[PDB]
Design a protein around this ligand. Structure first.
Ligand SMILES: Cc1cc2c(cc1-n1nnc3cc(C(=O)O)ccc31)C(C)(C)CCC2(C)C
Ligand SMILES: Cc1cc2c(cc1-n1nnc3cc(C(=O)O)ccc31)C(C)(C)CCC2(C)C
Ligand SMILES: Cc1cc2c(cc1-n1nnc3cc(C(=O)O)ccc31)C(C)(C)CCC2(C)C
Ligand SMILES: Cc1cc2c(cc1-n1nnc3cc(C(=O)O)ccc31)C(C)(C)CCC2(C)C
Ligand SMILES: Cc1cc2c(cc1-n1nnc3cc(C(=O)O)ccc31)C(C)(C)CCC2(C)C
Ligand SMILES: Cc1cc2c(cc1-n1nnc3cc(C(=O)O)ccc31)C(C)(C)CCC2(C)C
Ligand SMILES: [Br-]
Ligand SMILES: [Br-]
Ligand SMILES: [Br-]
Ligand SMILES: [Br-]
Ligand SMILES: [Br-]
Ligand SMILES: [Br-]
Ligand SMILES: [Br-]
Ligand SMILES: [Br-]
Ligand SMILES: [Br-]
Ligand SMILES: [Br-]
Ligand SMILES: [Br-]
Lengths: 198, 197, 196, 198
């Protein structure tokens, strides 16, 4: 059953995301409730950023961690072609064109994680300071590794608004729900209907 | 501990419980199997909402799940879904309680919802529509017989369906179930892992 | 034609209020409650109105201004999904059962008398007026269409469709987009070519 | 007068025109193809206006200062059913602007960056728009380093308000922010006078 295969894969991603967050310096020093808030507030953009960057090698598609390629045809057939194109044009291709490396990706995800605008944070200023610490490092990295590109640091930060809106649209249009195709849903129900009864 | 899979398994039960209920509805299984699937997908959200709303008549300021779990208004607002929780209580639960909607009337309303001829992709909508017509014909007869002093009770039942429609949409829109049934197992899982090395 | 559109909306708002006032017992309600009901319902009320007006029309919607809007424009404007929901769930259903204007008026009166509206000082009063209305609608259906005992319910069971379609219309900016890109682009181009 | 909808349309007409005149005074903007100028304005007018009254509202407390001089307090917003976004505007934009003392030169640059959005759909030459954006934030960085050298991270802090502006912009359109704030009273007044009439 593809459904349980999907569900445990999500459990796996949640696991890997938390472990990644704990490896981020000073994150675990935050109040436990604040750590949960940041994860819940960011795990959508964080995952989108991840598979977008992973999909630089792929053409007209998205590369999942499970190795599964999702082409734009499936997306448009699933009724989410607009956002899929938004992901490809505003994130994937932009990452490809500027050759965003994994260090830069990690910093951007760290910045996203340290979102001081998240509601219910007991100490936003503490979170803000950690974000400041991160992009200070990112600028240093960009300056030394790409000195012929003085504007690279800003270009990285200016992908974040796109990630913000795309993240919202993805939830709005049930992006992940619909990228299973609802064949797994139909199959799931058909199995239920054909089961023994009374 | 595996929160997402636990959550999917819990949804698995409710869907199945709903499937068994649907097959016990007369003439439903006589429909094309594809159309049966279509109706369930189109209706499962409102069908479940109608169920726990009526089940929550005994409860105050809260919702009673089939799993026996009592959910309070505090938790809902704290989970960020307090607006819908209130509309569920005001537009469905309290209205059901006030008019003393019985189990037979609830079953018919859910049968009407199930037999939705507006569902997309139905091979024979007229067939589904005919089954709906047969259902609310019965419901009217029941209401006039058991509550003759209330001539307008039949319509009052039908006029809860628009509320159920909108509330159903908002519930999906604001991830109602995910935030209600799924918050605690996930938060527990995260907190355990965060306190670990 | 932006000002044409704005003035047309002003006209519709006017006609809707006047229609509401001619509805019995409506004006006897508290004034703040009358406002609440209008705001809560004016979307579904208008949708019901042009849907029924569009029965004569094929694959399209007939506006009060006489403007015909085809299915092509809607899908090109990116709102073809709802447009089809309007046509299939409302317009064609109204056509098939030959819903007359008396039945339409009652349904809109029921919508207007929505006791679920937020902030109502006396919901029970509003609910009572709704009860008065559909009691009358049943009597009308029984006498004019006695060979159709289920017609009354069939009318009421269009209201959930109207409810969802009303919501979808708002979130997808249905009215905004049915003017198209052109009136807005024209509007801005005029601004840009103006002196500086 | 009467006709509340037309009054409301006229007011929006005025604001957009003010925005068009501002855009034309931005260097190299008018040199773009006219169709591209329209696209950028449609794509950006919402965030551009939000950025404007947010910064204008630095002087006021628990409220928003409109160009017409009208003060809108938080409770009217909550009473109008748009209190959630109003708080997001005050917290994520207004107070942040006030705290860091964002000047009008920095505000103008940020709006110029927003205006020069290369992610806008249908642009005939996105690279041309992107180049103009690059020119702008290059200038903004120079300005920040010159005027606020004791604040090395000020440039990034400015850019990192743009994701907030992006999401707040979307929510504002989604919840009919302007309509419920600007249009509630003139419409309610009109209805009220009609209802008390014969
Ligand atoms: C797609 C997806 C979304 C989420 C989650 C997980 C996923 N999943 N599920 N399977 C995935 C697989 C990939 C992948 O292969 O790249 C990315 C995300 C995935 C968690 C469980 C972290 C909750 C947060 C949301 C709902 C955003
Ligand atoms: C709500 C939801 C459920 C699931 C999934 C995803 C979601 N989604 N989808 N968007 C979401 C957004 C959030 C959120 O940001 O809070 C939480 C869950 C979300 C995946 C894709 C992980 C499959 C597993 C199930 C079906 C449980
Ligand atoms: C029924 C149900 C559906 C879903 C979800 C959960 C449910 N579940 N799961 N357990 C439930 C228990 C009840 C109940 O006790 O009433 C209702 C719905 C329930 C999640 C949270 C997984 C999101 C995915 C969908 C929306 C399919
Ligand atoms: C489309 C439309 C919507 C609304 C309004 C008005 C309209 N308009 N505007 N022109 C219309 C024309 C028709 C029509 O021809 O049927 C219906 C509605 C119309 C008012 C002014 C009542 C405010 C309430 C909302 C925004 C729902
Ligand atoms: C927000 C809005 C504005 C306008 C119009 C419609 C709206 N919309 N669109 N959806 C709305 C929904 C509501 C509402 O339900 O409150 C109010 C106004 C709405 C029409 C179509 C009447 C043209 C006139 C202007 C452009 C002022
Ligand atoms: C700018 C603006 C836009 C709109 C509307 C209103 C405005 N207006 N109108 N006057 C405004 C005044 C300000 C302001 O003081 O900053 C901002 C936006 C304003 C309505 C209410 C007509 C909804 C339709 C759209 C969204 C086009
Ligand atoms: Br999109
Ligand atoms: Br950029
Ligand atoms: Br966007
Ligand atoms: Br709600
Ligand atoms: Br009612
Ligand atoms: Br739709
Ligand atoms: Br029906
Ligand atoms: Br301006
Ligand atoms: Br919000
Ligand atoms: Br400015
Ligand atoms: Br920040």
């Amino acid at each position: 059953d593809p459904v349980t295969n999907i569900c445990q894969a999500a459990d796996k991603q949640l696991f890997t995301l938390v472990e990644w967050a704990k490896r981020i310096p000073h994150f675990s020093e935050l109040p436990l409730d604040d750590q949960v808030i940041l994860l819940r507030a960011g795990w959508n953009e964080l995952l989108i950023a991840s598979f977008s960057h992973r999909s630089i090698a792929v053409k007209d598609g998205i590369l999942l961690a499970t190795g599964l390629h999702v082409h734009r045809n499936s997306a448009h057939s699933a009724g989410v072609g607009a956002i899929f194109d938004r992901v490809l044009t505003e994130l994937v291709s932009k990452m490809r064109d500027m050759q965003m490396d994994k260090t830069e990706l990690g910093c951007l995800r760290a910045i996203v994680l340290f979102n001081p605008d998240s509601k219910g944070l007991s100490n936003p200023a503490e979170v803000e300071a950690l974000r400041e610490k991160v992009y200070a490092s990112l600028e240093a990295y960009c300056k030394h590794k790409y000195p012929e590109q003085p504007g690279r640091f800003a270009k990285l930060l200016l992908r974040l608004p796109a990630l913000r809106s795309i993240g919202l649209k993805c939830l709005e249009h049930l992006f992940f729900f619909k990228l299973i195709g609802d064949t797994p849903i139909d199959t799931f129900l058909m199995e239920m209907l054909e089961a023994p009864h009374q």
